[model samples]
Target chain A: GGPSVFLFPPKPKDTLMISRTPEVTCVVVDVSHEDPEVKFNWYVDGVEVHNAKTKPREEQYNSTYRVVSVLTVLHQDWLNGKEYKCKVSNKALPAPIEKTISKAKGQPREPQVYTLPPSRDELTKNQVSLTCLVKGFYPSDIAVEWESNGQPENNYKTTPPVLDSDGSFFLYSKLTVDKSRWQQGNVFSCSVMHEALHNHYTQKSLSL
Target chain B: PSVFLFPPKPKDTLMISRTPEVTCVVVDVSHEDPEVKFNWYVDGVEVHNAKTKPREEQYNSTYRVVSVLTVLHQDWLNGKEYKCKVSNKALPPIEKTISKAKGQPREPQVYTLPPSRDELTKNQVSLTCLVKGFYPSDIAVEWESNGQPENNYKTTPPVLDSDGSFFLYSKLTVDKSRWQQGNVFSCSVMHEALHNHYTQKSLSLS
Candidate 1:
């Protein structure tokens, strides 16, 4: 291939938005390239990310060549509303060019939060965890906190956002508390904050 | 080469819906380059309305797409060919073809059988008409005695014979007292595929 001509400017697109698949959250960028080898730079959320790959294609019509660079991210990070960017530099180009794909800006979906009481197997332990399931939410960042009878309970672990097949996000958080507290007639509540909801928190609570 | 246009199952050749649908499956589509375009053709003419849908195969990290077309029942009976083609950036154009079978037409052999001597002595006499060795199984049978039609006669659907032909039987029963000797009973057959289109056989009780 001769010094490839840049037929089109670099264009970046969210591959998942175009067509959905859990395989990867990709930003597809197109630019032309050849010998003298091209240079690539990838960044996510203002920080550089390595371990990404590119597929370069030769333009069969003539000296024009092209490449589609795909930057893949974990489902969790992609759901966290991160921005991705790709840069390409080649010998024929006067300077390097870059394209950016930002987080989706649209109406968000509120999560349907529910808390399940401890099962019988969980009752056998001295320490039990109340399970909270939050699902069907979009724009995936959410904050989950646990409370006991209006008192702050900080011993809770929330999982990263997980995507469902239908483009929804789900999460689970478990709050570990002493089994004796629930037996003594204590109420435990799970509070969630998301952009889709009003200024207040959405709460689901269970009392024995 | 991985594109497949599904042909009718062997069992469906015996019988199927009057109007039939065809399906095409395209497999081994990679996730990185999953965009695929499908085009449909019917006897070298392009069709615009055929539908194609894609589904991700999570197990193998690939995509499996399906394309379907429903042709007119009359057109299918007239024996039209269909083709399904798929193309993508990584793979060249690949296609598959399918069509219904058009068998030869053979006029059925018509036979009229009179009731046995013992049957004739009974209160009722039953006449039997047999149609055999027809290529197309769908045949219309009509029974008549003299100038009037016999609406009460029992006729059976066609059944396939050993040599890929078809056979059917129709029987008419009448009271012995009502039927005098020398009365003529006739059986007529019709098949759309036959060149003559109609065949008749008759027997007169002696």
Candidate 2:
């Protein structure tokens, strides 16, 4: 019913370090009919990170005001499990918005991926379905793609990620392939893209 | 350092039928002395029932104590208020009250974890049954395969949710070969909130 303000770490998992140096960035966006007067403060390990430059910009879209605030941090202090967060305040928000930086995994963890074959009853009705379970990964963000014989497949269903007690995440993607494809020796693959792999993927294949 | 006694806040809700039984347990009370004493009070009157077991325990090299008071439901309804008072030489006397109130039991939302396979095969498969967001931790969960109850499974104790509700998790493992012959698995939950009925989810390839 009123204005909205959000503060977020642009890239939670990876900051794309340069020359072994750490530079993290966060953004705050406020949308309202008028300028919302947004402010920002930065903290690391409960101590203030002074000299946090807040760059404010404004844009008008369809006669509405959109304000953006960018907070920049340049330090190597996060290596020892120090928390980096940006606190945002605006007239529109009832409480200050605090966004903590999600550190990159020390080492990327490959997802454990597997496929479950169609049950016997499913085959009798010419309904062959396969489900892929990908578990045990950090950062909770992932992309799963289905492929049949090197061609991208569509019409599959993917579930939202679920959090585990250990702070890891898991998800499932289900694809229903044609019975004729299974009979014709078509290879089905489930490929997952995650930050754990450097521009690579983990895949599992199933064939009859 | 002096020892301290802590009794849990009284039960938020209570129901009394023809026969009601309630147990009050004080947890993690610490004291430097071993010979701590406990007394029970019902509606301001002292109760010396034999059912009360007040004792001290050693936890993590520190002397701690737990006291329990079990009473008949009729006595609780008649007195309407009960308290557990603990006393020790190192600390002042501390007391907590447990009382009866009119309340309704909460029903649970029962569902199966979505990742389980729908088809049966010879491979081993595991399914998880979740019962969440219920009040009053008394619950029974069981699995039935092909209409016969099976007992080979593991269940976690009822865990309190952040919202003061209760949740439970159970895992059932079976070979896909067992299900190849058209067997169905069902998870059933029984609780007072259901009122003679039970909530269940049956899994089959269909």
The 0-to-1 C-alpha lDDT of every candidate, in the order given, reads 0.63, 0.59
Candidate 2 docking class: incorrect
Quote the lDDT for B28 in model 2: 41
Worst 10 residues of 1 chain A by lDDT: A7-16
Which sections of candidate 1 miss by over 4 Å? A1-208, B1-78, B81-101
DockQ for each of the predicted structures, in order? 0.01, 0.03
Over A12-126, each residue of candidate 1 has an lDDT whose tens digit, in order, gives 1222232432222232223334452566687777788775666655453444445545555654455455666666666655556666655465557877776666544457768
For model 2, what is the alpha-carbon lDDT of residue A33? 57
Residue pairs with clashing backbones, model 1? none
True contacts kept of each: 0.00, 0.00
Judge candidate 2 against the unseen true structure and give its global Cα lDDT, from 0 to 1: 0.59
lDDT of 2 by residue, A99-205 (tens): 77655555445566766565443566453556676665766657788987758888666656665444556666757677766777678888877756554467778
